[PDB]
Symmetry: D3
Subunit: 166 residues, 6 copies
């Protein structure tokens, strides 16, 4: 493994570019291990919490314990902004340095699924994001989890390029 | 490379544990490539934006273009929640499956640094997070960037363990 | 990195499974760095040659010098079987050992594209398989390469599982 | 990890070079996870099938179920061309781009080993290519596999270099 | 993965630089998987033996069987030089080639811990260097190992840079 | 990537095994990035210094500045013990934990090559250990380096296995 170092790089733009292609945005979502869920707290300030997730058919699924911090907040305002990003890559253009990454952002409202069988279905979507293993859930386990359904009302993607030239 | 698959895993708890050790929380921050900045939007809903950053001496530094989306929001409410996380690891206990990750969260208020030399200093903290290369910034480049200073008022860390047993 | 060794494994089946999903077969093709081109030689015996390639719209593209070995053969019989495979993965089922891989196979006939502009187009499909860089081709370079077009008449995929149990 | 991209690359030669050194060709064979077996089908056209293998003392060993597709073909013509290749490497010469790989090719005739103990011996050569684990084979397992012995009559190696310059 | 090759590199200096920062030297020690223990043999010549180790609070811990080669030597001279190094990195300065690594060196004297409980404590420091797993040690296992304690009297670090220019 | 953790492991033996096969010992040497050179210091105590190296035909080659620390020592006693090791691997036997590595050790005497052309030859052996690039050496560069030749009088290899069982 090797590195390229420069003595005389001059900082320049960053430009973001919008990703239009829905499959490409979904690809980012599907590649991500965690997501960052923004919730407005009880004082009107941001709260960002990382969480595991599943995604299918314009819908995000999460799960948590049944209380409290983020739960109290969602009960007051259930609008969430869920953001995803993969690491940056470093690209040298031939000289020129560019550090590039991409992200997805989903906005929607949180429901807590109550039906026991719907909860299992959703829990399966979440687990399938991380393993091919078969999961069972006892009734008491399904009872002691809140399963979040977030139909995605707006889904966007962005490429960010941070640039420097010699 | 190899994988372990099970036919009969039963979902169980997730538990979060609080990370008290400040150096350990800072280690997470220092390991992270990007951070997820939560801002309350103009309607009171969450907006989470990934961004590059630097961290030193209980202070986060970011930079952006001088407008608009996130800028308009910060001008109305400059409280931000900035969250960091490293990938999950998979641990098999010997049977038992555990998927474990850790995160940091910083809460503080955003200033936009106006002094040209302070802006360069801060830009250096940000760049040093990603490379050892020396960056210069022309005056016009320093002018055309907003450099965000976020003294961290509360910094917390959390380990999350998602568990299943045979 | 770690390994699991067993003292008492008993060899069992191999089973192949057919992959029906065309996008999944194309995914294998798109993941592969090289392909293995089977040509019948002048005596009726197999000749398998690895080659770089591009794939779009049920068509494979290759390129070579304008002579000789494989060229003489194709001039007598231009039917080729082009095969692709990704490495094996090792999966332990929980005990049981399974070594699993997947492959694609395309059958079609080889044309040598003569039009200079068609040759460039095809050469672009091939290069785009390996890099995002822009390639130019002088006229003399386009002249001194044979560009193979292989419309795919049959495309199949297979998963192979080699199994052992304790 | 980083990438180098160019705006103005001009495609040039590919050259193959012959690898004379037998130990070097055997090294390629020994590094490979799978091999691509070319068989002439019943209509005289190529059939290329990937397969696992072992190699010792100028002899390749494979195994399969006792029927059918490739078996019917080998019963008509047991000449096979078995080809191996490792991934390409990318080399920048300092500018100049070169994508380089190497391959081996073995030509020989297929026997199906009938003696039960010879079959086990050969199966061991194959397994030792992939693991250090001890494999047993019940009699019924040895019965229900065809074990292919292919003394190698011609073994060749080739380095291929695909080149572009600025 | 890619490589950069040059036709016309001119060998130049190597320079070592002293690492003053104790935490940085300890970081090297903590990163290392093995250490190389120098012992003067019975004829006055060097003997360098690799070994696993633990490090805490300016003290190195090792363990071995209770005899013989290195044991006889230490009984005559228990001064040891224990050296650590991480792989080299390759850095291209933009042209210029630099191959850089770092090492730590600890000098101290070896005791063999006799108290059974002290031996377990030390064995724990060693194991914690390699895994988070809980180890037990039967009395007979603790008896049949020599546990080496080496208070570090001098600890130094060095960066070595091997350089070539175009 | 995943890990296996145990609650109840019992420490056991370490056993070393002697590696007899000269090609296998040379393979370890050839795989190593650095070597650890033991020299007896001026007081009769060990000094272990890491260094780059080349190996061909039972001979090790190193290079350094023309002074001082290790040079003064070698002028009094030019016997060196040069040791090599590759990382450990972790092997789970199926339960049982084994951490395994291998090392080589070469004993010989150090000459400093004086002839300018011999020095270049040797410097080439060293560089070829790390890159395929062509190195030149001006006369003044060859003058300002000591090139060490160490015909290997004894070369040995050892596998070390550190074991724990459930
Ligand atoms: C990548 C990864 C995946 C995760 N997946 C899930 C999951 O799917 N479901 C789930 O319930 N949890 C998950 N977690 C943890 C998730 O962030 C927790 O729900 C959260 O930490 C507890 O949520 P809360 O709002 O109820 O916290 P509370 O206990 O109500 O808040 C207590 C306080 O602790 C601090 N805090 C809370 N969360 C974090 C954070 N993670 N990092 C640093 N400080 C924090 C804040 O100061 C907060 O106000 C995951 C964590 C990681 C790192
Ligand atoms: C890891 C990485 C690092 C980055 N580092 C920086 C940096 O340090 N400084 C910086 O200014 N930018 C950075 N970006 C991009 C940062 O997220 C942008 O500032 C943001 O995308 C534009 O911000 P804004 O609020 O001004 O967007 P606006 O242009 O005001 O918003 C337009 C709309 O586009 C969508 N959108 C905005 N951001 C995203 C997002 N990134 N993902 C998906 N959809 C989005 C939303 O629907 C938004 O309302 C980075 C991006 C990545 C992925
Ligand atoms: C992965 C990789 C990618 C390649 N991509 C291309 C490409 O896209 N275009 C291209 O033209 N070539 C490519 N090659 C080389 C391709 O295999 C050559 O065209 C081939 O080696 C020469 O083809 P031929 O039939 O004209 O050989 P000839 O020179 O006519 O045959 C001479 C003899 O040498 C031996 N031989 C030929 N090919 C090989 C082989 N590769 N391995 C071992 N022995 C061999 C055989 O005994 C053969 O009969 C690639 C090679 C590798 C390893
Ligand atoms: C790397 C890896 C290693 C393998 N190792 C072995 C092994 O050692 N022994 C073994 O018996 N098999 C192995 N296989 C599978 C080997 O390719 C099968 O024997 C083959 O797929 C079935 O062979 P056949 O000629 O009897 O097929 P048949 O069932 O007779 O043919 C049916 C049809 O299915 C299609 N087809 C057949 N093979 C493939 C292929 N693999 N890819 C895409 N389409 C195909 C063709 O259209 C073919 O005509 C391996 C597969 C992979 C990917
Ligand atoms: C990285 C790794 C970690 C290790 N960790 C430990 C550990 O913590 N504790 C421990 O006791 N051992 C460990 N070993 C092995 C350690 O080097 C042995 O103690 C040593 O090999 C036997 O030591 P000795 O002086 O008692 O050898 P003896 O059996 O007394 O010497 C016999 C002769 O064999 C040769 N020889 C000895 N050691 C080596 C060597 N390793 N490489 C090549 N030839 C050799 C020499 O010619 C020596 O004179 C490790 C080995 C590796 C490679
Ligand atoms: C893997 C790597 C490869 C190297 N390859 C070479 C090479 O081939 N040629 C070469 O000349 N040097 C090389 N070095 C450095 C080699 O170890 C130096 O020669 C050495 O550091 C200076 O040697 P000396 O005996 O002349 O030191 P001196 O300057 O005479 O000693 C000064 C003091 O500094 C300390 N010290 C010396 N060496 C080290 C060490 N490396 N680690 C920690 N403290 C130390 C000791 O306390 C020593 O007594 C390499 C270093 C690394 C890490
Ligand atoms: Ni590079
Ligand atoms: Ni494992």
């Amino acid at each position: 493994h090797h590195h390229h170092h420069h003595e005389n790089l001059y900082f320049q733009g960053m430009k973001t570019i919008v990703i239009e292609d829905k499959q490409r945005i979904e690809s980012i979502i599907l590649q991500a291990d965690a997501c960052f869920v923004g919730i407005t707290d009880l004082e009107g300030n941001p709260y960002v919490v990382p969480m595991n997730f599943g995604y299918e058919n314009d819908t995000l699924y999460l799960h948590s314990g049944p209380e409290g911090g983020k739960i109290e907040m969602l009960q007051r305002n259930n609008n969430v902004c869920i953001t995803f990003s993969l690491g940056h890559k470093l690209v040298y253009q031939h000289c020129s340095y560019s550090m590039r990454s991409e992200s997805a952002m989903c906005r929607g409202k949180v429901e807590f699924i109550e039906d026991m069988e719907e909860k299992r279905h959703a829990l399966d979507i979440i687990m399938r994001h991380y393993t091919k293993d078969q999961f069972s859930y006892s009734d008491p386990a399904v009872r002691n989890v809140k399963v979040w359904k977030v139909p995605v009302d707006q889904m966007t993607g962005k490429v960010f390029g941070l640039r420097a030239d010699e």
